[PDB]
Amino acid sequence: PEEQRAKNAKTILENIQIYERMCDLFGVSEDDKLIIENSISIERMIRVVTDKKYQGKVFCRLVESTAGKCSARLGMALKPNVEAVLTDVLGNELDRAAVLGKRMGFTAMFKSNLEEVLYQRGKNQLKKRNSAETFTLSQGASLEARFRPIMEKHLGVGTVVASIKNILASWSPLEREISFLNKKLFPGPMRQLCKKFEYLNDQEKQLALNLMLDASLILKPQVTHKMIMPWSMWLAVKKYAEMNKGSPSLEDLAAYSGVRAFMAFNTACYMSKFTIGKGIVGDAEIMENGNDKMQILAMACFGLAYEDTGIVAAMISQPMKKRYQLKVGNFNPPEEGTIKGTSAGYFHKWAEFGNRLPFNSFGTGESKQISNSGVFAVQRPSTTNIQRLAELMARNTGETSDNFTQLVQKIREQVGTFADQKANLREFTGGYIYDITDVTKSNPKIPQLGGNSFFFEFTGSDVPRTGAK
Amino acid sequence: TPEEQRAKNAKTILENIQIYERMCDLFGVSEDDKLIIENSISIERMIRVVTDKKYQDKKLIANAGKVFCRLVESTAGKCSARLGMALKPNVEAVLTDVLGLGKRMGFTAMFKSNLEEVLYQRGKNQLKKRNSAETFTLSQGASLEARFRPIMEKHLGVGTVVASIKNILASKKNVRKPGSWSPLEREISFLNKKLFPGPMRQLCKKFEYLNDQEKQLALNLMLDASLILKPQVTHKMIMPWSMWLAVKKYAEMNKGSPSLEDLAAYSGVRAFMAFNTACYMSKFTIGKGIVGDAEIMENGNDKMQILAMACFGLAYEDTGIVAAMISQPMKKRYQLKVGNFNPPEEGTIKGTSAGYFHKWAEFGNRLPFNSFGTGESKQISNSGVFAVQRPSTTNIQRLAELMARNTGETSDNFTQLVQKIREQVGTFADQKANLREFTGGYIYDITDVTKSNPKIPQLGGNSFFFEFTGSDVPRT
Amino acid sequence: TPEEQRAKNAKTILENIQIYERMCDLFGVSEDDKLIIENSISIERMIRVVTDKKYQDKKLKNAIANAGKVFCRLVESTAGKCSARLGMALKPNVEAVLTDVLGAVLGKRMGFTAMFKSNLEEVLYQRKRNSAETFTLSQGASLEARFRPIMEKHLGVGTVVASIKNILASKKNPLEREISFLNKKLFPGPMRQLCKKFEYLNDQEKQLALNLMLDASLILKPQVTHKMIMPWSMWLAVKKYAEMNKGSPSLEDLAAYSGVRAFMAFNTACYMSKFTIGKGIVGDAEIMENGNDKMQILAMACFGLAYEDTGIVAAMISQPMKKRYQLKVGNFNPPEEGTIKGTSAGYFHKWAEFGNRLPFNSFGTGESKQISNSGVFAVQRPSTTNIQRLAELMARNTGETSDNFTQLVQKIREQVGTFADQKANLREFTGGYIYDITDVTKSNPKIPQLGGNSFFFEFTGSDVPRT
Amino acid sequence: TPEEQRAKNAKTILENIQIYERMCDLFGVSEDDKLIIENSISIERMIRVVTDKKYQDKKIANAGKVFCRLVESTAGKCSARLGMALKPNVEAVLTDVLGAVLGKRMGFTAMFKSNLEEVLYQKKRNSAETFTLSQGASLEARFRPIMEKHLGVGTVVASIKNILASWSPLEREISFLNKKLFPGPMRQLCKKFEYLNDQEKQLALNLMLDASLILKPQVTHKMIMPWSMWLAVKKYAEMNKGSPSLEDLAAYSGVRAFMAFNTACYMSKFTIGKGIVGDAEIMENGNDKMQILAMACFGLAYEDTGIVAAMISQPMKKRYQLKVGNFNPPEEGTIKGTSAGYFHKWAEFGNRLPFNSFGTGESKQISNSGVFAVQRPSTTNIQRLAELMARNTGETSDNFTQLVQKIREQVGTFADQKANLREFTGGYIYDITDVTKSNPKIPQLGGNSFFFEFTGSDVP
């Protein structure tokens, strides 16, 4: 754990170094290095120059500040100078064609998570392969081909299915992807069907994929969630910890999971700034709102676009607003704007990440007791956990001799059994929200939920041209 | 744009008004008698009968070149039946003068069909029904003459298309090809477009390969399934020609009130406004005799409910919906005291009720299990990030719907699809309590043209128009 | 026709009265003793034996020795005290009483008396071919073989299944008609398709078919005809009461086997009618019979209520409803020594119509073919579709003739399955109500307060010692 | 026979007391230290380890001696020591007392140990969630056929899975399993097990095992106490003029088994040492260990905690809220006396099938046949209708595929009906003073009924 945060602190400091120099290369001032927008541009720029299969002057649209006002600028640097900064900071490493698949894959994951909060899909045109309703399973879909194998665990079932669908139109790329899909998928006939993949027709592989994709909208898959912030926010931490002796050091807050990752976020919010200008997504005449933007930033850093809005409302220091109630723009440097600082104590509560199966078909960190064996001849109702028995039977009663048609029916009947149980179904049983002060998890709390939990919901309160359209 | 449509509709409405006015002159119908609903029903039907070549060629006598039309003749609030007459070419001359027709008569035939559906459970005084009695609610456009079936296809129910398929299957036991395709190929394509997605649509593809036994079971299964797995049928406000003439007169005689082009709509609030405006000057007949008992006097408010129900095709609609928008208490079929709407031997003239619709709605037209307008979304579930205990938020109905569209194989036999249809019924029936049609569909006040104040009606109770009550009029 | 029905019924009732009064005279039963239920039970049973041409032809074939005397155990009384007596008459006299009053037609007449006796026995005893748990489907199972064909519609699915099993067992040492009768009663669907295939089925398949159709009918309720079958003495108590109070409704006014007039004929018979109270009950020869307990069984036997929902019956009677083993009632046979107790008038304070069709269908003002709505307006609403009626519609309309035995068996299991899950929405006799006896014109319909155990044969802590 | 059995039990318990008292002399256990539960546990295990013929066949350098870990008290504080006796001296104790003869008594001795272990810790053959069906799992294969009835479906399935990984012992086990299983298609599949392929065999075992979590099996239960606790009953009875005799308390079922348990707690002892299960630094709690002991004696590890709570005169705590170590001799430790009247309520044992309660106050009426056309809901018992269809509509012609499908819908019907499912209908709780079941009582059942529930008030 301390051994972990020490390995984290090393890579974070090395990223602050890369970020500080690239800003110097592109003429970003010391105060402007703390504008979130500049980090989006700098990190993107690195990914573009690094993109070997895409392959000198380099251009970077950035923000320039003057008092409280801001303006966009076009920075310029030489391509050899850009590659020399990475080479000189990262010595005995960089052997990867994509600099470091982790390093840039994380910057690309933040960019993907922000895109998910800002748009249902609507940015990368409409190059969709899967149905519109399966987009909540499309975590990390904005990622480049390069970063998907290394950023696998963070990827959604929809993303992996889309990658397989694109492929269809020591190792094997197709086998590699179905393997990642197999690990993510809810245990049972869906995993059996993955093992039977490549034994299928081109017409059957499609049914296989689309079925497992649809089924996962109820039979939840396992996806890894980390706290991914822009580099300029890790700079704000490093700065605040050094400008404040008593406060927690960068090493203490150098985490991507647990309470330290939430403290890392709030301490970054002391010195971090964002831009505010005219125009929002789909309406150029509406002004950007500072509280609405802050929500989208906190959601982007945690990948909250598909999370239960009620869970989110419980940890947030501002009222939770649905997507089309927010007045927020591109996050790209505005032509003209104003500087707005970040909200210091945004996250009053914190929570652990649900990195494993939400229904917990194995009960790894749970009690294994699902029923009682009667000793006394005393009247009692049935005490058997119906959903855990359903989870166990699907996992346990798999027929290896089963045909594609046999497996297709078993998945449909797995969906039905859980859909008939709908009201009693519980995800992440045993998981609670804790206060920031509550480091030890000594005092658990219930989020107190009810009503629409969909972020991409259309409401009467929606902003003109959005959810109204 | 909606204005380009209203201008086009107002042109059709004005041609129809002229055809009507000219036909009334030829049959000696007084200026005031032109506004009697019954006269429109008789003139429209006459125009349909004369222009039907199949019936005119089979009719052949002097009487074959004659056109008899039972009309209402009123004195001073009191009316009487009269046999109007014109020669066949004089009827065809009026048509040649106003027009340079098929679709025009199809619409008139759709009002008569929707009036018949409200008036009768059977509708034709004939027990020769191809479908099971309980599937009568899927018989939109059943009374519609074979000629008008292709043009009005969209307005027809699954039961009307299935009984048309069954008709072809009975004759071809005991042939045409107009497109490109054959009448049966055309009919199964129409059913496939209406039918709820999933195995029912897949059984439509395999239909031409099915043997006469599998074919009949297929039809009945798709028909029974359609009673929960609601099909796609288009609806329009189709009112008589005399009612459009009563819209014309009122807009002319009253400045500031919307024009005929403003009210020229068969959809939205402007259709409700056109119906409500048409009722300022329209009239109908009240006589002795109702459907069932020949000695019961007709009720005015009861006849006004049927008229309203005929124009919007509300026979098979949820009574609680209709109740929330009409200006009288909603009565079930057999509580109503109304006659066949044909001109009576003797009766009294009654004016329609102005502002009969206090509330309005838009038409279904798409699959009812799908959502309506701007206000829904595409998000069906959540993807948990924080390990915090929460219930399943997945939309079971929307997921069931997505899986019906997305999970198609092509490699399923008759029997396999038959079980898949039955399971599809099972899945939705098991969901009854939380199953909802037209999610995002609201009721609006008549004055609320903007749709700024959406309202959900106070549902519950028996929804069926053809249910029996204690109040059921003696003999019915 | 409803008034014409009662006139035709009265003609039969008056003929039954004449047969009954003349038999009592032949058997030396006094005018006051003719109103005793136990004598009506004994006299009707007696006639069924004398008219049993199979037994009677065999009885003289076994015989000079042809002593054709008819013996009958009867109740004789001295006001409130009563005692058993053995009556006697000659077969030619018993036969002449039939011929003189009537004129083939006698079968239907005796078939009904035997039905009242099966209905009486279904109440008194809960108990050999079918499973014990399926006994609630064995109505008319005490009817002798000769009466089962006439009284077909009154027979339970278990009674018909028992007859089919009995034919199949004798064939292991006609059926076609029993199958047709079973087919009619059964809930439509794969159970009816399994009836059509039954002659092609092997002996193992045949046995599984009958057992499954029976088990399934315990939820997928069959059609059984019900009429109010009252003993002959009871109809005599109506005749006598009607000609006593001239203002009160006549016999013709109360000559009904169904509706409020049947319930009114019952309450009228109750003024003058009498039964016996003795020492000994069913299962316990030491316990004294209770009057209110015996009156409950009488009303139940007259309406065939043994298997009917307890809560429904409870809501219609003038006494607190008791489960079978809370009752102190013996045989309805003449006691050796006992007392005379008159029946309880106004026993039924509420009435209802008989449910002779499939329970899952609708009754009264709900018999309409409309079971769904076709959406015209884009207005948010729940689905209005009648799930049980739609499941019944698919059962009749669909179903493959290309179905094998195992295909049809798996389908029955699946049909029982859907309805077992549908149990929240499942309503039997929908649109049917309970009415105050005073309300003839079915106005002000009431709904019984149902909840708790509805099984008459349930075991409680109130259960009488030995039972 | 009820008091004739007590006579046969008294004879057997006394033989055990004689074997025990002699073994304790062989290993140098002081008269006071004989009444320590931990000493009865080690002595019993020693006799099983010495009577293990194959293990003795398995083994100058040969130490043909017996080694036993025992508790040595002194004052009130205690210690752990290693006792030794010559193997033929130990054998002579068994010959002096006994001349089935030994296997049955050591089987029950092993059965108490399995019950103790199941209350202490939550099997590699079966899935983890199926552990509540593994009664008698700890038993060595010598004891399994003898104690058959007492074994859980999980145990029997793991015995079959072991044979597969290599009458016959397989045929034996399948018929033992057939008797236990919920009646219907599971019992039919058991009959087909010989004709199933190895893949179908594994599916059948796991499906039968998983099903049993809802479709409850038939398992025999008895009151099993260490020999020292019966030595305590034998001591206490001879002391009080009012007190019932040992023969009067010689029961393994009914009220007398509870009165025997309580009478034993007046003179029996255990130890409070440093170290609990998992946390080698936490001090053991007396009342906590007393709950484990009562639960071990009655095999209550998997029983509904709410039932157990209503019967015991101390607050019911879930497994990880307990400060209890293994019942092995502790290095340091302090002698703690057992609690004199632990059970204030009692109940009879299950032993039969928990769902089908034949007779009791449950009649054959399962449904109603409507007469009047009155609106009402369906009154038909689904549970009972499902149960009847399993007896009446069995198809011998069914293959593996068809029987598996039927198991699944049998589970599905029961899962759907969970709200209306009741186990041991007409089964009640009674006061210890209520000897002839006159005033039945019902336990207040509401919360989580699982003993192995994690809780917030846990122990790290």
From TrEMBL, chain A:
Keywords: Capsid protein, Helical capsid protein, Host nucleus, Host-virus interaction, Ribonucleoprotein, RNA-binding, Viral nucleoprotein, Viral penetration into host nucleus, Virion, Virus entry into host cell
One Pfam family, short name: Flu_NP
Entry keyword annotation includes RNA-binding: yes
GO biological process, one term: symbiont entry into host cell
GO cellular component, one term: ribonucleoprotein complex
GO MF annotation terms: RNA binding; structural molecule activity
InterPro entries, A to Z: Flu_NP (IPR002141)
Name the record gives this protein: NP
Source species: Influenza D virus (D/bovine/France/2986/2012)
